[PDB]
């Protein structure tokens, strides 16, 4: 629930409280991406990437 | 076997992994570019010596032989 | 004792201090959000191997030995 | 000799270099001035443990034992 991504920095913050409180964490461990619209996470039949 | 070894130090200043550290690997990259060279410093773990040859060589524990066929009379 | 030790080198390639290096440390940065995982490995130093014990396992240098009674002739 | 050795792993963690590695040196430091502390924890290499050791001292084998003259009757 509620993954948020930076444009570059790999640190992402995640909340299971639906925004009531945020917690910062690693696990992107790369430059992530700068797509030209919005969407970053795009997924099908589980297998989110 | 690693029950047999003395204490030792590394032979230089190398960065080990601890939570008082005065050097901070950084949380994450202020890194606006793409290809300016970065590393992957691998996961801090036990630093492995000689795991290629773990069991290896076992030296001979004795002194040169006076050894000759010795027939000890029964009685 | 330390001088009893072969020439040891730990297998997978580990970073150490120098003034010559390729790896930029950074001494200061943005760590603007303290909120990033703050992973600070500690200082450059000497890495202790089996520091727990100087008193290693002591290999028996006894060689296969049948204790045989000796009463020496007084004459 | 450096063949003979248990495998060893340093008594606490430190940073290997693997290309999957978690921690990251960044694509570069952000180094606006010279006053942001430079360093290099330097490029990865072998570990160094006792290069004070060339071939070592060698712990004795033969055990406390009468050193006498075996008298063999020549013929």
Curated annotation (Swiss-Prot), chain A:
It comes from the Viruses. It is found in: Virion. Intermediate/inner baseplate protein. The gp25-(gp6)2-gp7 module is involved in sheath contraction. Involved in the tail assembly. Belongs to the T4likevirus baseplate wedge protein gp7 family. Heterotrimer with gp6; assembles as a (gp6)2-gp7 heterotrimeric molecule. The (gp6)2-gp7 heterotrimeric molecule further interacts with gp25 and gp53. The gp25-(gp6)2-gp7 module is involved in sheath contraction. Interacts with gp8. Binds to gp10 homotrimer; disulfide-linked. Heteromultimer with gp10; a gp10 molecule is disulfide-linked to gp7 and the other two remaining gp10 molecules form a disulfide bond. This is Baseplate wedge protein gp7. It comes from Enterobacteria phage T4 (Bacteriophage T4). The chain holds residues 198 to 246 of 1032 of the full protein.
From Swiss-Prot, chains B, C, D:
It is found in: Virion. It comes from the Viruses. Induction: Expressed in the late phase of the viral replicative cycle. Belongs to the T4likevirus baseplate wedge protein gp10 family. Peripheral baseplate protein that is part of the tail fiber network. Connects the short tail fibers to the baseplate. During infection, the baseplate undergoes a conformational change from a dome-shaped to a star-shaped structure. At this point, gp10 rotates and acts as a lever that unfolds the short tail fibers, which then interact with host cell surface receptors. Involved in the tail assembly. Homotrimer; disulfide-linked. Heteromultimer with gp7; a gp10 molecule is disulfide-linked to gp7 and the other two remaining gp10 molecules form a disulfide bond. The gp10 trimer interacts with gp11 trimer and with the short tail fiber (STF) composed of the gp12 trimer. Part of the baseplate macromolecular complex which consists of gp5, gp5.4, gp27 (central spike complex); gp6, gp25, gp53 (inner baseplate); gp7, gp8 (intermediate baseplate); gp9, gp10, gp11, gp12 (peripheral); gp48 and gp54 (proximal region of the tail tube). This is Baseplate wedge protein gp10. The chain holds residues 528 to 602 of 602 of the full protein.
